[PDB]
């Protein structure tokens, strides 16, 4: 079907996330999957130094290891996320994902999240490290300002951009979703700018509606080399199911 194709490659891009040192290794075994490698796993800065011995130890080094700085809050403290950032760096992340600061920005302040996004991009660009910016739209709401967060942290640097922390009420939408992947078109950046919808993807068919509008709106190359799946353990068992595994 249409339903497994897209299963099969939402898996091979999802970042899955989850608190215990016993949680995480489980979380790495999980993402070695009877049909391959997910993409990343997602997790607490403190967890990264035993996630990589897990990983390199049940052979799939590959696997990315993701995590957040300025986290969930998004404040706009730019000392504070990037001192954070330095740490997650020095504890071995592949690319920290921060939060955008969102409320500083609704109440009018554009120049801060610049300023945060960009300190934050020379401490990762400086080790190799991708950095990803999450704008919360559950908390911006507004098309407008969904906009303008995407592309003031497109313009400082941002490697992706993602709708959600998934620590607010409301994560990532259809609508929303389009909305960040139009600023990524209209600002011609999809060669190097990916996308991923965070927060309250669920199911297989949750994360198929996610990588239509990015077949739609940038094609098939584009989502299998950069749009990304999110979500927990929950969501890579229903893939699997809609691959007829479990």
């Known amino acids: 079907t249409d339903l497994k194709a897209s299963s099969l490659r939402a898996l ?3 970042h899955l996330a989850t608190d215990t040192d016993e949680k995480v290794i489980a979380l790495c075994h999980q993402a070695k999957t009877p049909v391959g490698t997910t993409d990343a796993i ?5 967890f990264i130094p ?26 706009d403290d730019i000392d504070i996320a990037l001192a954070e950032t330095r740490a997650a760096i020095a504890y071995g992340a592949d690319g920290v994902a921060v939060v955008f600061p969102y409320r500083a920005l609704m109440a009018g302040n554009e120049q801060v999240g610049f300023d945060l996004v960009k300190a934050c991009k020379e401490a990762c660009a400086a080790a190799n490290v991708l950095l990803s910016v ?12 969904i906009r303008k967060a995407s592309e003031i942290s497109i ?5 992706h951009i993602v709708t959600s922390t998934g620590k607010v009420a409301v994560g990532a939408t259809p609508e929303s979703a389009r909305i960040m992947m139009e600023v990524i078109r209209d600002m011609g950046v ?4 990916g996308f991923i919808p965070a927060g309250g993807v669920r199911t297989a068919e949750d994360a198929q509606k996610y990588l239509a509008i990015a077949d739609e709106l940038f094609g098939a190359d584009w989502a299998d080399a950069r749009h990304y799946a999110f979500g927990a353990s929950s969501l890579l068992a229903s893939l699997l199911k809609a691959l007829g595994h479990g």
């Open 134 to 145: 999450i704008i919360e739209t559950g908390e911006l709401k507004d098309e407008a300002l």
């Open 12 to 14: 091979k891009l999802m």
């Open 155 to 159: 313009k400082a640097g941002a490697d």
């Open 50 to 75: 035993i996630a990589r011995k897990t990983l390199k130890e049940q052979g799939t080094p590959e696997i990315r290891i993701w995590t957040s700085t300025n986290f969930p809050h998004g404040n």
């Open 190 to 193: 999809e060669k190097t700018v």
């Open 42 to 46: 997602y997790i607490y800065p403190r």
